[PDB]
Amino acid sequence: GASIFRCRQCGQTISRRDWLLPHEHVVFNPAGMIFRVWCFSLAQGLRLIGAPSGEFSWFKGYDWTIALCGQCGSHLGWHYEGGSQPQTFFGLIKDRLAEGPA
Ligand SMILES: O=C1CC[C@@H](N2CCCc3ccccc32)C(=O)N1
Ligand SMILES: [Zn+2]
């Protein structure tokens, strides 16, 4: 009953409890905004915007790209790339997702 993560704003399919990567990081951006981030190995239904940036990266050795909900454009988090073990992952804002049945 709690296996799929969807965008809270529009219901787009985003990820699965199975795809969590151990999981929960509380971070601040330079504007002091707090994000409660869940790391996922895999996500779908996003639109990755721009080219990667290392600036203010929360994760040592990773560059980030903005991940929008590909349906409604709501900011769901970031895709991280350029690191090692693992090379890539997603950091999604927990309170911008909804959890429910398959
Ligand atoms: O690893 C990261 C990702 C985003 C980044 N960040 C910095 C750039 C400005 C900005 C604006 C809104 C949300 C986040 C944000 C961050 O501090 N670290
Ligand atoms: Zn959405």
* Cβ count within 10 A of residue 83: 15
Which position has the token pair 């909900």? Answer: 69
Residue nearest to atom 1 of ligand 1 (CA): 57
Asked whether 57 and 68 are in contact (CB, 8 A), the reply is no
Closest of 8, 4, 75, 71 to residue 42, by C-alpha: 4
Asked whether 5 and 94 are in contact (CB, 8 A), the reply is no
Q: Which atom of ligand 1 is nearest to the CA of 80?
A: 1
Q: What is the resolution of this structure in A?
A: 1.9
- Distance from chain centroid for Cα 65: 10
Cα separation, 83 vs 62, in Å, equals 5
Which runs of E-coded beta strand occur in the chain?
4-7, 13-16, 24-28, 34-40, 46-53, 63-69, 75-81, 89-93, 97-100
The method recorded for this entry reads X-ray
Q: Which domains does the chain have, with CATH numbers?
A: 2-102 (2.170.150.20)
Name the phi and psi angles at 24, rounded to 5.
Answer: -115, 115
